[PDB]
């Protein structure tokens, strides 16, 4: 259980974004139904009033939280990978529009999952804004918790992979548009019961053998890291 509070741009806190520039759900319950429109931007996908100004090459930092900002972020049980997708706001998340900018499953070195390092990062992870057409975008941050992903939701609806999905409203002002955004995958649609990384046993199988769900990170991506960029406590 976890949600996005707001974003930092080049280490500058953009302030509380909930229901403002984040399409926030009413709570931190996971999404589990792979076929649900809830897979797009969570249970309450609607245009919210603001879109954060950025330029190509900016560092965009998502900040997640559990109950209060900068608390314990997400339960230590929720081991899994972190992905960030972009789509043109045009789409409102519909159709084959989601392009991956970032993937992080397991760091062999440190022996930590992305979720472990997100907790350490006080809920902060970042992507470098790509050189796409200036305009309005959704950035979809996705945490997959696998603590029950040994089952499929479709077979056993009290277990299954859990998706913590947050769509940020981002307006890209300055960019040379040197990497125009290609068509992408649909959500719902890209994840099915057979897709790798959806069904996996973190209790029996080694984390080095884990293989995150496709698609692959777009070559136009400039991402990206899991690490604190600024102190929320200084406000």
Ligand X SMILES: OC[C@H]1O[C@@H](O[C@H]2[C@H](O)[C@@H](O)[C@H](O[C@H]3[C@H](O)[C@@H](O)[C@H](O[C@H]4[C@H](O)[C@@H](O)[C@H](O)O[C@@H]4CO)O[C@@H]3CO)O[C@@H]2CO)[C@H](O)[C@@H](O)[C@@H]1O
Ligand Y SMILES: *[C@@H]1O[C@H](CO)[C@@H](O)[C@H](O)[C@H]1NC(C)=O
CA distance 143 to 165: 7
| 36 counts as binding ligand Y under rule CB under 6 A | yes
- Smallest gap from Cβ 126 to ligand X, in A, equals 24
Nearest to 21, CA basis, from 125, 136, 177: 136
| Two tokens, residue 26 | 């009413």
| 144 counts as binding Cl ion under rule CB under 5 A | no
Q: Are strands 162-172 and 52-54 parallel, antiparallel or unpaired?
A: parallel
CA distance 51 to 7: 11
The site that binds ligand Y (CB under 6 A) totals a number of residues, namely: 4
- Residues lying near ligand X in the complex (CB under 6 A): 1, 28, 66-67, 75, 77, 147-148
Among 11, 12, 16, 35, binds ligand Y (CB under 6 A): 35
The answer to whether residues 62 and 166 touch, using CB atoms and an 8 Å cutoff, is yes
Among 1, 18, 50, 66, binds Cu ion (CB under 5 A): 1
| R_g over Cα of the chain | 16
Among 10, 19, 28, 33, binds ligand Y (CB under 6 A): 33
- Smallest gap from Cβ 182 to ligand X, in A, equals 36
| 66 counts as binding Cu ion under rule CB under 5 A | no
Binding residues for O2: 147, 162
């Amino acid at each position: 259980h976890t949600l996005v509070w707001g974003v930092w741009v080049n280490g500058v806190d953009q302030g509380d974004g909930r229901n403002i520039y984040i399409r926030s759900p009413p709570n931190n319950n996971p999404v589990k139904n792979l076929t649900s429109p809830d897979m797009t931007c969570n249970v309450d996908n609607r245009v919210v009033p603001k879109s954060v100004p950025v330029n190509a090459g900016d560092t965009l930092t998502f900040e997640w939280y559990h109950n209060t900002r900068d608390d314990d972020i997400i339960a230590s049980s929720h081991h899994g990978p972190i992905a960030v997708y972009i789509a043109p706001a045009a789409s409102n998340g519909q159709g084959n529009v989601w392009v991956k900018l970032f993937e992080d499953a397991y760091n062999v070195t440190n022996s930590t999952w992305a979720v472990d390092r997100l907790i350490t990062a006080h809920g902060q992870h970042s992507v470098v804004v790509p050189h796409v057409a200036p305009g309005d975008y959704l950035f979809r941050a996705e945490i997959i918790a696998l603590h029950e992903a040994d089952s499929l939701y479709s077979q056993n609806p009290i277990r299954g992979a859990q998706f913590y999905i947050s769509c940020a409203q981002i307006t890209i002002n300055s960019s040379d548009d040197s990497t125009p955004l290609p068509a992408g995958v649909p959500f719902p649609g890209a994840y099915t019961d057979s897709t790798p990384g959806i069904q996996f046993n973190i209790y029996t199988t080694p984390a080095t053998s884990y293989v995150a769900p496709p698609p692959s990170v777009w070559s136009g991506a400039l991402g990206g890291s899991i690490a604190q960029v600024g102190d929320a406590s200084l406000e």
